[PDB]
Design a protein around this ligand. Structure first.
Ligand SMILES: OC[C@H]1O[C@@H](O)[C@H](O)[C@@H](O)[C@H]1O
Ligand SMILES: OC[C@H]1O[C@@H](O)[C@H](O)[C@@H](O)[C@H]1O
Ligand SMILES: [Ca+2]
Ligand SMILES: [Ca+2]
Ligand SMILES: [Ca+2]
Ligand SMILES: [Ca+2]
Ligand SMILES: [Zn+2]
Ligand SMILES: [Zn+2]
Ligand SMILES: [Zn+2]
Ligand SMILES: [Zn+2]
Ligand SMILES: [Zn+2]
Lengths: 123, 123
């Protein structure tokens, strides 16, 4: 069970994290690994047709060692990934978004402004 | 533009309003009148297949004089209403929810516990 917050305001990856945190929540992560919840989240984003940040990145171990912010791995072969992603250079600092082109996961640089999804495990 | 909060915690209508307000938000209302937003909101609740409160009731004016928490009228003949609703006895205190039966609006007593949706407009 969760509390899920969607925000139309855009910000970079770092600010997105602090945004959720200031609200007593976290950038969406365990909710994305929950089969029912992820379906509900993506139905919303499907309608909105915009890019949203998620709480995953390669900042700690680099390359395609993606980690959710709660420390659980985001497998490179996950079904959550958009077609042909992740594909950015492994030597880059990479953050994960829900890319509007496919309404699925995608690796990008952490500087662009995107909408935010926060979570809070209920409890 | 909005911040939208969905919560799996269940509460009666009054607790729902307090829960939203204590978060600097309001029980969903103007976002339900926004064409893009409402469809996104309903995509989510459709997946969840559960009942949720919305910020409309007849507490101020009674009967089928439904008002959104922000003073705007919820037309007894809005396309937002489930088929054959509103239909509860007009002498009752009636509150509005998104009824899982149709994933459309419905009038009910204000005492049953249901999931919550809060909104915060963004300028
Ligand atoms: O908008 C994001 C997209 O940017 C492209 O440059 C990149 O090749 C894609 O893999 C995807 O990340
Ligand atoms: O469960 C919700 C439903 O409850 C019924 O008793 C009522 O006839 C319907 O109009 C609807 O409000
Ligand atoms: Ca794939
Ligand atoms: Ca990419
Ligand atoms: Ca009707
Ligand atoms: Ca009814
Ligand atoms: Zn779950
Ligand atoms: Zn836009
Ligand atoms: Zn709008
Ligand atoms: Zn805008
Ligand atoms: Zn259930």
């Amino acid at each position: 069970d969760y509390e899920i917050l969607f925000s139309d305001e855009t910000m970079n990856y770092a600010d997105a994290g602090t945004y959720c945190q200031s609200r007593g929540m976290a950038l969406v992560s365990s909710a994305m690994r929950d089969s029912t919840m992820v379906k509900a989240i993506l139905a919303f984003t499907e309608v909105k047709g915009h890019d949203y940040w998620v709480g995953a990145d390669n900042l700690q171990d680099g390359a395609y060692n993606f980690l959710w912010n709660d420390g659980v791995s985001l497998p490179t072969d996950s079904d959550l990934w958009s077609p042909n992603e992740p594909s950015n250079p492994q030597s880059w600092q990479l953050c994960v978004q829900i890319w509007s082109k496919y309404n699925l996961l995608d690796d990008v640089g952490c500087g662009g402004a995107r909408r935010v999804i926060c979570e809070k495990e209920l409890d």
